Design an enzyme around this catalytic site. Structure first.
Site, PDB file in Angstrom:
ATOM      1  N   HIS A 138     -28.297 -11.846  -6.573  1.00  0.00           N
ATOM      2  CA  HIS A 138     -29.186 -11.110  -5.676  1.00  0.00           C
ATOM      3  C   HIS A 138     -29.270 -11.617  -4.235  1.00  0.00           C
ATOM      4  O   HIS A 138     -29.278 -10.823  -3.294  1.00  0.00           O
ATOM      5  CB  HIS A 138     -30.604 -11.080  -6.242  1.00  0.00           C
ATOM      6  N   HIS A 165     -25.228  -4.020  -1.586  1.00  0.00           N
ATOM      7  CA  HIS A 165     -24.629  -2.800  -2.094  1.00  0.00           C
ATOM      8  C   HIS A 165     -24.182  -1.862  -0.985  1.00  0.00           C
ATOM      9  O   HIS A 165     -24.683  -1.911   0.134  1.00  0.00           O
ATOM     10  CB  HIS A 165     -25.632  -2.056  -2.971  1.00  0.00           C
ATOM     11  N   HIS A 223      -5.626   8.563  12.207  1.00  0.00           N
ATOM     12  CA  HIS A 223      -5.540   7.135  11.904  1.00  0.00           C
ATOM     13  C   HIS A 223      -6.952   6.648  11.546  1.00  0.00           C
ATOM     14  O   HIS A 223      -7.864   6.726  12.370  1.00  0.00           O
ATOM     15  CB  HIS A 223      -4.981   6.459  13.170  1.00  0.00           C
ATOM     16  N   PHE A 262     -33.669  12.552  24.527  1.00  0.00           N
ATOM     17  CA  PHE A 262     -32.427  12.795  25.235  1.00  0.00           C
ATOM     18  C   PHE A 262     -31.263  12.867  24.259  1.00  0.00           C
ATOM     19  O   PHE A 262     -30.461  13.806  24.289  1.00  0.00           O
ATOM     20  CB  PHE A 262     -32.124  11.690  26.231  1.00  0.00           C
ATOM     21  N   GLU A 263     -31.165  11.852  23.407  1.00  0.00           N
ATOM     22  CA  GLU A 263     -30.089  11.790  22.432  1.00  0.00           C
ATOM     23  C   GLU A 263     -30.144  12.951  21.443  1.00  0.00           C
ATOM     24  O   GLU A 263     -29.153  13.646  21.228  1.00  0.00           O
ATOM     25  CB  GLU A 263     -30.129  10.456  21.671  1.00  0.00           C
TER      26      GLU A 263
HETATM   27 ZN   LIG Z   1     -30.797  -7.729  -7.352  1.00  0.00          ZN
HETATM   28 ZN   LIG Z   2      -2.044   5.748  14.839  1.00  0.00          ZN
END
Ligand SMILES: [Zn+2]
Ligand SMILES: [Zn+2]
Ligand SMILES: [Zn+2]
Ligand SMILES: [Zn+2]
Lengths: 301, 299
Positions: free
Chosen positions: A83, A136, A260, A275-276
């Site tokens: 953990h 995770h 790619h 704004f964003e």
């Molecule tokens: Zn855990």
């Molecule tokens: Zn490439």
């Protein structure tokens, strides 16, 4: 103060000139989770990693068929038995195993024609979307090609038509190199969306992530680990997100020359505003040239 | 309910839906950067004023793979009183705010170097609001931003297939919350964010600055109504609202399917790697439910 654009994002960013602001997944508590898909080593009680279904999926795998049914695959990759361990602490080989596990699950999902894109991503830190402390990452298989993918296809296509070259194959010439491994190179994107954003680009022109082999997985595992640890040091262990940008499942031969894949790492250092949200345009407070110099001078002593 | 992907011409992108369950003096007072104008005109007892942004995202002093950071970054001080929030101002006072935008927009429109102007408001530090004093901002860009391009593309595709303007069908495509004389507020069908609200003008108009004084006060009322209901039902969460209008050089050909609107987004949740990576969002609440809850809320 300037606007910068890149074929990959295919959008303008504004540059205008930093630090950060047990459990059911642990070994032994497997019944405490959702159905398992597989683990590593294969069916081993002393597992290093395992991929399971997400208990509360964003898209349900039990619905295969203006609106589209919420069918899709939402899986969870438990990166460790312990953990307290963070993906960044794991050894290069162990990460490579995580990278190979993605590939594995990607290949299984690819068998469904209903899926068009798979998003592999990692959240560390509650404010970055990480609901649990245990190390995770996640995988979301979508029935549609997402906006960032469509934009990328368009941008890299326009650039390829005008220069006859793949923008990412010119990583060392278009961006600002931070570190380099045997098969990859990390850079500070020229038109980076976020402050201290880092891309890990494979040196070999490949259109999809799952085309990755074991040797490159460990080599990438090392560069990724190096980038996460330098981020954690230089930026004071900020929350972060990294996502794999690959090609759609039905990518065409015609698109192959300029498609790619790469891995994007974004340390959470600031939020967005009206704004964003309204424009889709971002404001980056730090140029990549400076991010490059700072990350190159950082040491792990 | 069960998961679904929804799309709308306006956003031109798929959103994932997967579920009243939700919830949450100063230098600007009557010392600041150069003033552009105020209201009433040149009056010491001003109700509002628009000034330059001291630390602009884009510099107005640079007029000319990369483009110079030229642009206009202005700040609209919405009130003399520090403790007042835009939501507390009376319908007429907001209309004044709305007219002030229009005014500044018209002045900026005189520059051919500008292609889009973004009017937006931030309330609450976590929503980007650097100061407590009630204020909004205006960012004039030399380029048409992604959301605008996407919208043009989506509303065009929809117009070519149906011969209609998606927003002119607000009442039929979305979920009506409230309605005024010239506008209607709705819970967008494929809303990006939980409890997202759009205020759409009922008359098909391609640009916000085409708004007149009568409509500005009528809009001021609907906006105030939507902000107060949000503040009540969601426990005064931070929020952002932005005006989605047409580019400065919008073409005649685009006019039939270009319809402006105001977007209100209450900050209730953040994003993760999924969102950043795909550009696709996950909305925990359907608009049908947002609509019913906002309609039943009382002030
Ligand atoms: Zn855990
Ligand atoms: Zn490439
Ligand atoms: Zn003040
Ligand atoms: Zn219309």
């Amino acid at each position: 103060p300037e606007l910068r654009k890149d074929p990959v994002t295919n959008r303008w960013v504004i540059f205008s000139p930093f630090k950060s602001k047990s459990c059911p997944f642990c070994i032994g508590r497997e019944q405490e989770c959702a159905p398992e898909l597989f683990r590593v080593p294969d069916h081993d009680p002393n597992w290093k990693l395992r991929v399971i279904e997400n208990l509360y999926p964003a898209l349900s795998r039990n619905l295969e068929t203006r609106t589209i049914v919420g069918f899709g695959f939402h899986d969870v990759v438990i990166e460790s038995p312990v953990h307290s361990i963070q993906l960044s602490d794991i050894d290069p080989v162990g990460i490579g195993d995580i990278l190979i596990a993605y590939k594995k699950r990607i290949n299984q999902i690819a068998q469904h024609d209903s899926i068009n894109y798979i998003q592999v991503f990692k959240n560390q830190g509650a404010s970055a979307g990480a609901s649990m402390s245990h190390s995770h990452s996640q995988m979301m298989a979508l029935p549609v090609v997402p906006p960032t993918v469509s934009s990328r296809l368009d941008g890299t296509k326009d650039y390829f038509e005008e220069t006859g070259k793949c923008c990412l194959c010119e990583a060392k010439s278009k961006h600002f190199v931070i570190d380099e491994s045997s098969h990859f190179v990390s850079v500070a994107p020229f038109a980076a969306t976020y402050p201290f954003e880092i891309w890990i680009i494979p040196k070999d022109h490949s259109s999809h992530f799952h085309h990755l082999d074991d040797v490159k997985a460990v080599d990438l595992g090392g560069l990724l680990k190096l980038m996460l640890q330098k981020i954690a040091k230089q930026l004071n262990d900020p929350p972060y997100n990294y996502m794999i940008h690959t090609s759609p499942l039905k990518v065409t031969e015609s698109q192959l020359p300029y498609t790619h894949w790469f891995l994007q790492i974004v340390p959470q250092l600031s939020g967005v505003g009206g704004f964003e949200i309204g424009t889709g345009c971002y404001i980056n407070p730090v140029f990549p040239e400076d991010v490059a110099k700072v990350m190159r001078e950082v040491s792990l002593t």
